[model samples]
Structure formats: structure tokens, C-alpha cells
Target: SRVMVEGVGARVVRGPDWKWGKQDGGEGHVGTVRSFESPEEVVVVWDNGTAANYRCSGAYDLRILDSAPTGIKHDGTMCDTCRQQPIIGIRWKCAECTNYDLCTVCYHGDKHHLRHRFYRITTPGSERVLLESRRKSKKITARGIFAGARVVRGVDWQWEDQDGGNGRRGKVTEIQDWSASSPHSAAYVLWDNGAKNLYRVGFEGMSDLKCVQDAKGGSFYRDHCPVLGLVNIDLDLEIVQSLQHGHGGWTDGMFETLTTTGTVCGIDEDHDIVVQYPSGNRWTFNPAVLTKASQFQVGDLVQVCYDLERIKLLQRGHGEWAEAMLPTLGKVGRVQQIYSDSDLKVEVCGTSWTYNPAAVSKV
Candidate 1:
């Protein structure tokens, strides 16, 4: 059931083979997908004040043109929490985590950590604005100088053109107080001329900086740098699982021969994972069990980085491990060789050994 079917609120064009398209307004007739009667068919509300149920996938009676303004059309992206594809209505994309998304339902369900801020996408092909984190729980730890406040050069002048000749103005990005005293206090400011420098804010009796504007919103500065997360699991990715006791539908000897490597098929409506292995066994799984099967080259850098519980699970199911492998955890290594099943031979500080690709992440 990993078929590409249009969800509700998708703008569609009736295909040439559509039976009702010929009888009504013919081919090129436009409509919006109202709901799904089945996985194969959807109820479309046509522009000419007509509604009809038509096939979506097999015969392809209707083709998705785009998503409506009130809907989402993020094709191939599924919610990391609920596993809903195309994310239906308001899709919440995490700023901190790579390829992490949540549907409107899961976004409000407290599935992901609130500390990881998200981009709020309202509609298809529309704005993906970074939402400010909620401020109610924010602790107010303040120094004399605060971030996001507009400041100007004070009356104390010493250096030539240090404040850009004529009393330069800038926004405080950081406040540095070395000894937690006024004389040692300095403000890191991004000047209007795009130059950033540290200037003394509270210099004992004389002021080196003056506040022109106080932050009405908050006393914090947002650099907005998004770094990728370590995990890169997604649809259609080659994956392998650590054998936990009851996860990934693991039965006796299934992990030994079958599910060592599998392609991610889909995430069901109930948020369970569906994966198909090379042995032709398709199984449903809990999301936590799967890790992306990485392809390591001879010179690639990788790090052995799974939690203690996951490492025990891998040891129990996948392969034999030596005590030497324990010290190599969290250390970066160069790939020396790759086995047929993608098990990597890595050299970390003269210690070379074959390790499962799922256990190490690309650095």
C-alpha cells in the first residue's frame, strides 16, 4: 500500500480515459479531491458544481495537478511520528532534525521535543516560515547588556572610526561579561554596515555603548543555522534493523537470514513500518528498530554511534563482537574495506575490524 495516491484537497485533472469526464465536461476537467472512498478511488468535487468518485492509481482516471491552498502536497515525505505521507494539512518540518516532518495531528501531539523548533508550512508551495519557540517557559537570565537590542556608540570615543566615523548603530547579538562586572563587560554587535565586532558596553564610570532600542519581543538573538541530524532514514531507503526482542516482527532466525537488509516500503496508517527484505519477506515493524543501511566507500569516514541498548541488540542478532570494539565507540575511522553485505572494515587508531553498517553512521 505504498502507492502514490492523491490525498484530500489535491487539485486534479480528469484523465482522457475518465468515463464521466467525457459525459460531463470531458478531458482536462479540473476538480479537487474531496476525500477517499478507497485507496484506489477518491471523491473529487469538479469546478462545474459536480462531484464524482474516480480511480486514482490503477487505471489513473484522475491525475493530481497540485495541492489546494489549504492542503499539503509534500510528495514522498512522511511524518516521522505518525508516518502520514504527503502530510495532509499543516506540515511541521523540524529545523534541528534532518528529514524530520510531522503532520498537524502529530505536531500538536507532543511527539517530538519542543526544544527542536519547526518550520510551519501552511499550504502547498507556500511559505515555510520558522516559528519562534513559545516564550512562556523561557527563563529570564539577564546581564546588563541583552541580545536583540539596538545600540549606538556612546560619548566615550577613543579609536579612529571604530564606530564607523559617525556614531555607528548596531544590534546586540551577544553580551560578554568576563568577570561579571561592569568594567569587563562587552557587547558583540552586528553593525548596520555588516561588520561585527565586540565593544565595551559597561566600562565602569564611562559608557562605551548606549541602548537605542530595547527588544519588545525577547532578549535573544536567533542565528538560524540548521544542522543536519545523524539519522537519515526515509521512504525507499535501504535499511537494516537491530534485533530487539519484539520489534520489527522478528521471529526465530528471521534476523539471521532475512531482515539483515531491507528496503523501506511504507509506514502504515497506524504508524507501523512496512519493510521488504531481499528474501521476499515483507514485514511490519516499530519505527525505532530500523536504521538506514549505509554505503561506505574505501576512504569514507564513519563513527560507531548507537546507544548502549541498541548496541546490545545488534550484538544479540547481527554478528559476533570483540571487546576491542567497545573503545572504538564515538571515534571516527576510515573505511578500509566493505563486505558483500555492506559490513564495513574500519581502521580507528590502528584497530581494524569488520562492523555492521547499521551500527556506524557516516561522519
Candidate 2:
């Protein structure tokens, strides 16, 4: 969420929680712009749409910018009768008074002869679907535990980020089965990705008991970075293949086995640069090719790799820049420079630099 905006030309739908303002030249004047929470500010129809703004203070004064831009496209579906999309309502009503409740799809998408203002209602799930769910809710044993449960310490189940576009996944390594009721149980789960204390249970849609996977010793999600939990959704090969990009694959809400990968680097025993190239005159033990994402360039977003106790170790020039564990594992910041002490210079929580910025990942 922390960003030093100066001016990068691009329009984006920023987080609902983030704020932006006028360029810094407005003096220390807090531009009464940004969000609705401002005292007095709303973007008026201005001649100038957007411009460079200096907010980030760093050796390299890079900027982040948001420009005059935005979108609006209906998604759901079209009409059923006239063309391609849609559905009906709970039941029927006065087709004459409100237009003969012809499956209710009529009231909204239907253009009729009558002109009468009608009433409406809505619910979480449609009436029939809800009824069917209640009728078929699986009953768990007295133990209240089920195979479809996702829990910590349970060497079962693979997970991904909520969007799954993040291309990260991990195995639930630990689990505690504490019964909640029939099929639902209280489970405290843990994953090698540094995720701990997540709870789960057995249910139809909620904590779905999808699959029983083969347990292994390697993990992709760490820092304990975890984006998703258990699911009853099944994914396809072509789609699951794109898991690294977080591309979503569909399913009848069944379990999936796309829990494998290409790099195979993060595996526990997968260490060793044996695939190392012969010292090409420039190997300071350097081998695994540094791409924009891994090299940690100046201005790369990063977070503290671990909890901090003595952040002082990461002091600028005198800073420790490699593998020096810090506190609050997820405290975020960005890389400020490269080759500083032969490592990536990282600023934690924004301005505070810490040990080995290289330890961070491309969030």
C-alpha cells in the first residue's frame, strides 16, 4: 500500500483504501484531493487531466502516477427470450398489474404493452438453490471431521491465492480436527508458506472437502504467502497450467490436482546450483539469471522477510544486505538500490532499510 509517487504515466483502479493527491509543487500543501475522506476535494473538470507528482523520497526519484481514466461494462448476462442471456425470479406475480409475471425475467428485460411500476425482492441464494442445499447438506460423523476439510497440520490439500492469478500455491502441512457439528469441524491449519492459524471445516460450499492429495516436502507458497485455501472446485489442465499467472480455471466445484510446477526450485531438497553454468568470467557465485522480477531493482516492491528485532543491522552503507532475518515478516517496503553491499537495498514499511532486500519477493 506504500508508494512514492513522482510520475509514472499509467491509469489504474487503485485500491479503495489508497489515496493520491496533486503534484508536490503545491508546497507542503496537502492537496485537498485523493479520496472522499478529504476535507474538501473532488476532481473537477480540469483542463489538465494528470501530471507528474513527487511524493516518494529516494536516491532514485522515480514516480507513480494515476491519470485521467476509468471503465464501465455490464458483465452478467443478456436477455433469454430476445437473445443470449439471463434467468427468472422466485416465482410468479400479476402478469397484468405488473406484466403477468412470466417467470419474472419479463419485468426487467421484457418490453411489454403495459406500463406498471412493480415491486421486487432478493436473497443470498435463489429460493430453489437454497432449498436444495439445505435438503442435501452432508452430515458429518460425530467426530465432525471429514476428508473434504482444509486444516493446518493436515498433510493434505493444496491451496492458492484467492485470485489464483498470483501463481503461488502450498500444501497444508498441519491440522487440528475439532468438531463443530455434523460435517463441519473446527480446524487450525498450517502451511509451509508461513501461513499459520487458518481455520477450516467441512461443508458444501464454504470449507469444502475436495481432495486428498499426495503429501510432499516442497512448497511454492511461503513467507508463508498463501492466497487460497481448500476448495471443492476442479480445474482443467490447460487452465491449471496457467496457475502461475493466476488465471482461473473452472470446475463443478471439485478438487484439483494441478499442485505441481515447472521451475521446481522452491522444493526443500531442490537447492544447489548444480545446473550452474561454468564460471563465465562474471560469476561472483552468481548463476541463476536475474530477471527484472528476481534481481530486486531499485524501486522494486518488497516486504520484510521475517520479524524484526534489530533493524539497525540494515543501516544504509553499514547495512547487512543478505539473509539477515528481520521482524514482522510481512512489513512492506521497496528496493531502493542494487549492489549496495553486494545486495539489494530495501526500505521497510516505506523509508526504513533492512538486511538483504533480496530476501523479498515480487508481490
Candidate 3:
């Protein structure tokens, strides 16, 4: 049966010492509220423009619904061998399962001391059931709260040359304090005239409530905050996964290549071009080269000259594959192409020939 729960509402206000004018130094307020399936999950947005999702704990006021029992049985299990040799068993067996009744030292006359092992019991109808020690269990909760845009006044707003203070001084905009003894704290502040600044504030004076509020402001209410919203939304999970897999595959291939031929020479990055040699060396090219060039294609092999530690590649009329053999003095092929803008392409070459735009120089 569906039930109605009381929602939590918050009234956000500009913090004390907050200013509004361009010079007086004040950032505006903004915030959101996201509802979760249960009080176990609640997301809050703050005036500073940060959002935070929280898993309800005893500390916060939360409303839980009364529902029928799902009949989910907790069939916990433990391993018998783990408890006998705590340290040694951990390497081979599950340390979490050591606490179960079945996890005990067995008697054998000829057997020297065998390490104990343990595993957790799974609930009924579970697949690949295994027990993990409570200590190793991770808490399922909202992502850590983030403090949005917060404005903290400087120790002295006015510049004083005689006081040995720099004429430039501004308020704090962000805080991060994550140490057990020290804690993490940060805040973001915006000036009256649309200029935004971020600053660091120590965690000594902050409370739990303040921490939660701060995280929420930075993470959830970003749009409403005075400063520009800078959320990391461009992460590509598929690319990350591919990179992980690629790394593993590359490592295996690299080992085979080394055994069959020779170790990777070297790799270097010169400007926007990345060069990988047979001697395990890598080279990265300068990114600015792309901005200066006209029609560079991705994965096009080109020779770059080094002058005073700076790379120089031709602007145009240079053959792409011609450059690969010049640097390594060996036959090389185009690998990939990197595109930067509409007109530019950065070419990559090697075992794989890829095409890219000149704008690839930026990345």
C-alpha cells in the first residue's frame, strides 16, 4: 500500500556577513529538494546552490513508512577455517565469515597449524551467496554531502600596506576538510558584481550540521548559487571501462611484444603529439601546436623537431606518415585520429592507425 510521508522543508538565507553589491562582497542564494523512496534517502538543496543526498541516520529527523514485511530472510553464514589463523587465513579465505558457529579450528593429529577461514551466509534464494565480516561491510547511503557556494569574510576586507597585508583580499567560497583529526572543509563565494571566487576555510569551527549543509550547497543547488555551476557531468563510464580493459589487454600485448622483439623503447609527449617508442619511452607533444596549424588530421604520423625543449611541427604541406620514421628511425603506421575543431585533425600512428582533429591537442 502506498503511504504519504511528511516532507522536510528548509528555509535558506544568506549567511551573516554576506554582502550583495559588487564591491561590498555578497553572493546570492539558491537551492532543490529531491524525494527518496524512504527517509533512508533524502536530497536537499541549499541557498548557496549545493545539493546533498543523505541516508537517514539517527541524527537526522526522518519519516519512515510502515509496510508489509517483504519476507527477506537474512541467512548469515561463516567459515570454519578463518578463526584459527586470523592473519594467514585472511590471505586465502574470508575473514568476515570467521565468526560463524561453523567457523572453528578442526583437530587433526598430522596437520600442523592450518589457517582458519570464514565466509558470510547469504539469504535464501541468493545467488553466489557469501558472508563478509561486518567490519568489511560498506554502508549504503547517499553520496557524501557537498557544501555549495558559501561566502566567508576575510580576516580583513580592506587592504593595509602598513599592516603588512596585501592589497588583494577576498572571502572564501569553498571548503574541504576530510581528516579524522583535522577534517575537510571548503566554501565558494561570489562577489556582488558577478565575479566568483573560491576559498578554503579550516574545519576547526564547523559542526556536523554545518558540514552537511555546506556539501549540499555545492553539490545540489549549484544553479542557484552565486558562482558559476561546475558540476562534473561529462564523465563517460563506457570510456573508463574501455580504458581499464585496454590497459589490461595492452599490458598482456606489451609483455608478448617484449618477449618476441624488444622492450618498448620510450614514450614522449611533444606539443599535442604522443610518441611511443620501442624502448618503453613515451612522448607527449605540445597542445599549442594545434591552434597554430590548419589541417592536421588525427592519427597522421608527423615528425616534430625539438628546439630549446620546445616542439616544432610544420603548419601545412607535410606528409603525415613521413614524420613517424624520422623520429624513431623505424617504420611506423598511423594509429588514431583526434579531432579538436571543425578544420583540424590530429593523427595518431603505431600498431594502430587512428585519426583525430587538430583540436585533439587540447586533450
Candidate 4:
């Protein structure tokens, strides 16, 4: 029973069982579990430069705050079914398919074959565990009903001004009474307007809550500058590709590498969207044409659409293309990964090679 409380990366907070009085400074501090010395001894290192040993289960001084540091980060990873990026919570990798993965919501929602097994990866540093195939046949009643996902009132919501007249937002803190039959249960929400309420999340396909931002969190982009103007806009988080090929004092194909996508890192004083690529290059884009790298999933079979000579030219601003990649030019490959900058890794001829997402096409 105590096995759940044992983990290396679990975040913990001080609990009620403090031996020291209120005069001591260590009260209500947070820390991460560094390691476990024995079955009963749990070791933690605090954020305030202090390390101590505590109990693993009964009579514990530390209580588990977060189980696994925001779970696995399938960054740039999109759900095979819904095509949502930054799959929140555990990522389920298909055992039968090559590089196929699913988010926890999608996996449990019965999007894949029941006979096909899966490997559940809870965290980036954890080992993959083979999960038994189950035919739950649970229909996805609601999307983005998890804690920390930003939400606004839906079409079914009658309560006006709770989210402000201009569409303010709230965050889901808990989903109460969640069962397969009633996946869309009551949600405990904390509004940005300093109020709380239990709203209908997704009851039999009727939802009062609509997700604006996922729990993993990302920045937003829009046509209007100084996004918060006379009225607040609930903008969608996007992966924007710059199309200002010649407008901003730049030559044609100068930003060819950015043809795929870059995350909106921040907004500048001039109200331009600051996009940062995976290669650590930052550029300003305002009123830009935004697009996503959702053309191919991780397991899709693809081939390099560009020739070796053209690939060399396209890789100028992106990154250098190695001569070793010559073997993968014509061969078909399975997409292994999608980087934050919209660059992709295609596993071909027993090696994974990185290329612009647009450079490859479905085989």
C-alpha cells in the first residue's frame, strides 16, 4: 500500500507531524524526493538547501504533493486520435505499432485496438512498463477535464459574468465522481475572478466547461497586438511558422527552417510574437500566418520529399545535414520524434535523422 508513496521524483510538502515547534523555520516548506535509502527511509532535498530523511508511509513527516514531476513530457507529441500536442499526464506507447503513442485521456477513451498492448511511460526518466490490453470501450465524453487545464464557460453555460463578460478563464482543480459510465462528472473550478464553483464538465456530451489551454501550458498568438485590449480574447495556443520571407528586410528562404513551426515564447514591447525554435533561435513575428506540424504522426511511414542537393540548401538556417543522412534520402522511415521547433526525426535504415517536417512526405 505504501508503494504509491515511494518514488524518486515525487514532490513532497511538510505535513502535520513536525517534531519542531512553530519557531523553527522549516514549517510548510516543499521538497523533492532525492532517493530512498531503505524500505522505510525516504530521503528528500528541500528547495531551501536542506536535506533530511523521513518515513516512507505511516507517521510520515512529508506528504506526497505531486506523484511524478508533471508526468512524462511528450513535447511536440500529438495524440494520434485528436491531434492535441503536449499530451498531458502519462503517455501510452503502442507495443504493436512503430513509434505510436497516445495520451492518457485518448488511451483510456478507447481510440486504439484492444488486442494491441501498450507500454505506459509515467515520466521521462522512468522505465517503460508493459500494460495489459483492455477493451474498456469508454467513449470520450469530455476533453481537457483534468486539473490545471484552463477553461471558459461553454455554450451550455447559463451563468454569465462568472468568467467576466469578456470571457475570462478558470482552472479545473478536481474532477469528482469520475467513472467510465459518467466520465463527465462535476468539476471543482477556481475562476480567475476569485470565485469557485462545481460545474458540469461533460455530462452525457453536454459540457458547461470548454478548454482554452491544456494543463501542460503554452503561449498564445493572435492577429491583434497588445492582446489584452479593450476586451479580453481567449486565444488558442499555436505553433506559428513565419511567413515574412521578404517583408522584414530578409531575403527569400532566409527563414526556410521556420516553415514548419515555432512556439510563441513571449510577446515583445512592440506587440510581436517572440518565437523560439528547437535549435535555440529566436525571431519576432507579428500578424504572421500560424500553422501546426500535425501533418504526420510519430508512427507514420514517410520519405524525404527533397533531394540530397535541395536538402542541403534547405538545411542552411535550420541545421547542417550530415553526409551520413544521404542513405535516408530515398528510403521510407517511421517518424520517431517531433521536436519543439517542428523539426522531425525519421528512423530510416536503422538510424534516426532529423529534418524539417515539410521536407518529408507520407510514404
Best by TM-score: 4
TM-score of each: 0.22, 0.17, 0.19, 0.28
- Would you list the clashing residue pairs of candidate 4? none
What stretches of model 3 exceed 4 Å from their correct place?
Answer: 1-174, 178-184, 187-363
Where is model 4 poorest over a 10-residue stretch in terms of lDDT?
221-230
The model with the greater TM-score, 3 or 4, is 4
Q: Write the per-residue lDDT of candidate 3 for residues 206-285, one digit (tens) a residue.
A: 22222222222211111111110000111122332344342322232221111111222233342133434322334232
Candidate 1: 10-residue stretch with minimal lDDT: 221-230
Task: Give one digit per residue, the lDDT tens place, for model 1 in 1-363.
Answer: 222423444444555346763422444333445667777777655433355677655565764433322233467678776455666555678988988987543443334655577886644554577864422112111122345667676544364566575567777775443232221245577888887777654333223455556432111111121110011223222233443334555453233122135677777886777776433446777676555645668999998764756765554334436666778777889888775334678888688877767778889
Tens digits of per-residue lDDT for model 4 on 297-342? 7899998855866777655435546777776777888999764334
Candidate 3 positional error at 343, Å: 29
lDDT (Cα, 0-100) at 108 in candidate 1: 39
Off by over 4 Å in 2: 1-363
Better of 2 and 3 by TM-score: 3
lDDT of 2: 0.26
Alpha carbon lDDT of each predicted model: 0.52, 0.26, 0.26, 0.52
Model 4 misplacement above 4 A: 1-215, 219-293
* Local distance difference test, candidate 4: 0.52
What is the Å distance of residue 296 in model 2 from its true position? 3.8
